[PDB]
């Protein structure tokens, strides 16, 4: 049950005035594509706080990638879901190497030890953590660690299932997408199919939908392994196959996954929110 | 559980090409606003058929308004949710005056007798029909009878909760909206509040959300009656208050509720789908 919003004073949306004319803001299956200028964060914050929303954030830091945790976590504290309940789940082979990061109120961090070695992340999110996540959070967000938050990443992303546009391909034709192209792989997508190329570095959704996605991708990767084939972009290839066949209910623009060193700062990006570390 | 979509060949959505530049296609709370050119109906038909979606359509035809049923139903057969399961619920004081209309396969009509007399429709949808609707349909759509379908009205509208832009106000400033303006009414909205003016002639959603809306509006109307006040636009005033405080998850453009005699055919409307009868 969703309680009433309180009175709020904000600018009237005008039907004969788009908030962005330069970009596609809705997919052909009626999922919002999230860009700056498409959302009033005050309305969204109200809606999600009234539900006492808890967001889980999963991040893997294996072997040398533990070095990325300090900046990742410290910048998440500045920019990720501030004001909402957050539970970080840090999966690592080196629990002692996790930096001691000071957290804002209503935020917690759990260190989960895993083995060091493709299949780890999807299997770990689904098989091992299924019951924990269902009990502890409403939404799960799954991200790469070799990253930093530079600007707001908030409840505008939350939805039953989301992917993020890969920053190298958002302006590309589908034949150029680096989908798995061998018909022998479960991740196979023909040259005449595909909506978008989604990056494996940022996806999420409700716990139920994330468990469905990660289970399906893990199962598909196991089939590929049994058949002696490894998809071109590993779990990302499978994520793309899944999101082709199960359309996401929001798509995040490349504001949400950017590499300034490789791609600069195009006019079409009003904010660079979550960016690659060199 | 949502099964995989089959392979489909369709045009690639291009992020740097909006499908409409002339109109707002998403609200500031990230609800799609449904216009022609924003959706691929083949994708949506697949998604909803894979769920074996059943749509209930409620319509009241009381006193002289029984005369509108023949055209309403015959044009609904041509244009409303064709290919999907439909259950019409015709509420009337004159069951014998309901025309015998031939229905396509997978479609059924129930005649529900009510008393003849504001409060009827909201109370009838909520209090009397609650259990029936939950058992029989997935979505409910609630419309005026003094109307005809001229073009496609399909699963693109379906969502947990939707309203439709009133055709007289979609280009208007909020101070001009005919909201209830007396603070003594439960439907009261101040001059500095409001997103849109929604028409009482076309709203809907999941059964659960429609029951919530109609219950809340019926309760609010009963409070008003006890306080000796009747909102300016009756149940529409209350519908507007409800949708201000509980944001709809889609908004239908005025393609979905038009009056050609009063308003002509503006360039911004590529289709006139559901229109007033003179
Ligand atoms: O030893 C490890 C190795 C991985 N990891 C974990 O796995 C995540 C993904 O790997 P990586 O970021 O290297 O992929 P990226 O290189 O960012 C993968 C991305 O860039 C590619 C080019 O390098 C392509 O553009 C591809 O499409 C894109 O997904 C990493 O962030 C860590 O959370 C770990 O903890 N220890
Ligand atoms: O004797 C009756 C009376 C009503 N009804 C039923 O109630 C529905 C609404 O009434 P109506 O269409 O007259 O309102 P409208 O006049 O279309 C109401 C609309 O137009 C107004 C101007 O006339 C304003 O623009 C207002 O904002 C808008 O909602 C009608 O379609 C029938 O299903 C019935 O069965 N028998
Ligand atoms: Mn990475
Ligand atoms: Mn009417």
UniProtKB/Swiss-Prot annotation, chains A, B:
Top EC category: transferase
Pathway: Protein modification; protein glycosylation
Record's cofactor remark: Binds 1 Mn(2+) ion per subunit.
Effect of residue 147 to R: In allele Bel01; loss of manganese binding and reduced catalytic activity
Residues that bind an alpha-L-fucosyl-(1->2)-beta-D-galactosyl derivative: 166, 178, 236, 259
Annotated consequence of substituting residue 147 to T/V: Alters substrate specificity so that both UDP-N-acetyl-D-galactosamine and UDP-galactose are utilized
Subcellular location: Golgi apparatus, Golgi stack membrane; Secreted
Glycosylation: residue positions: 52
EC number, as in UniProt: 2.4.1.40, 2.4.1.37
Effect of residue 102 to M: In allele Aw08
Modification after translation, per record: The soluble form derives from the membrane form by proteolytic processing.
Listed cofactors: Mn(2+)
Membrane topology designation: Single-pass type II membrane protein
Notes on the domains: The conserved DXD motif is involved in cofactor binding. The manganese ion interacts with the beta-phosphate group of UDP and may also have a role in catalysis.
Protein family: Belongs to the glycosyltransferase 6 family.
UniProt function note: This protein is the basis of the ABO blood group system. The histo-blood group ABO involves three carbohydrate antigens: A, B, and H. A, B, and AB individuals express a glycosyltransferase activity that converts the H antigen to the A antigen (by addition of UDP-GalNAc) or to the B antigen (by addition of UDP-Gal), whereas O individuals lack such activity.
The name this protein goes by in its record: Histo-blood group ABO system transferase
Gene: ABO
């Amino acid at each position: 049950f969703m309680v009433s919003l309180p009175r709020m004073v904000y600018p009237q949306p005008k039907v004969l005035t788009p908030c962005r004319k330069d970009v596609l803001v809705v997919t052909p299956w009626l999922a919002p594509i999230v860009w700056e200028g498409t959302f009033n964060i005050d309305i969204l914050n109200e809606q999600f706080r009234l539900q006492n929303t808890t967001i889980g954030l999963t991040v893997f830091a294996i072997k040398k990638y533990v070095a990325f945790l300090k900046l990742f976590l410290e910048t998440a504290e500045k920019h990720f879901m501030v004001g909402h309940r957050v539970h970080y789940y840090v999966f690592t082979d080196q629990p002692a190497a996790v930096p001691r990061v000071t957290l804002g109120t209503g935020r917690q961090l759990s260190v989960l030890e895993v083995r060091a070695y493709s299949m780890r992340r999807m299997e770990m999110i689904s098989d091992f953590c299924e019951r924990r996540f269902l009990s502890e959070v409403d939404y799960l967000v799954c991200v790469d660690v070799d990253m930093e938050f530079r600007d707001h990443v908030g409840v505008e992303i939350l939805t039953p299932l989301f992917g993020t546009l890969h920053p190298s391909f958002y302006g590309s034709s589908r034949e150029a997408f680096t989908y798995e192209r061998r018909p022998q792989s479960q991740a196979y997508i023909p040259k005449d199919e595909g909506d978008f190329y989604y990056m494996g570095a940022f996806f999420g959704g409700s716990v139920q939908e994330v468990q469905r996605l990660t289970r399906a991708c893990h199962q598909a990767m196991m089939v590929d392994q049994a058949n002696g084939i490894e998809a071109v972009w590993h779990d990302e290839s499978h994520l793309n196959k899944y999101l082709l066949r199960h359309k996401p209910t929001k798509v995040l623009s490349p504001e949400y996954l950017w590499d300034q060193q490789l791609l600069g700062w195009p006019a079409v990006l009003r904010k660079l929110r979550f960016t690659a570390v060199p």
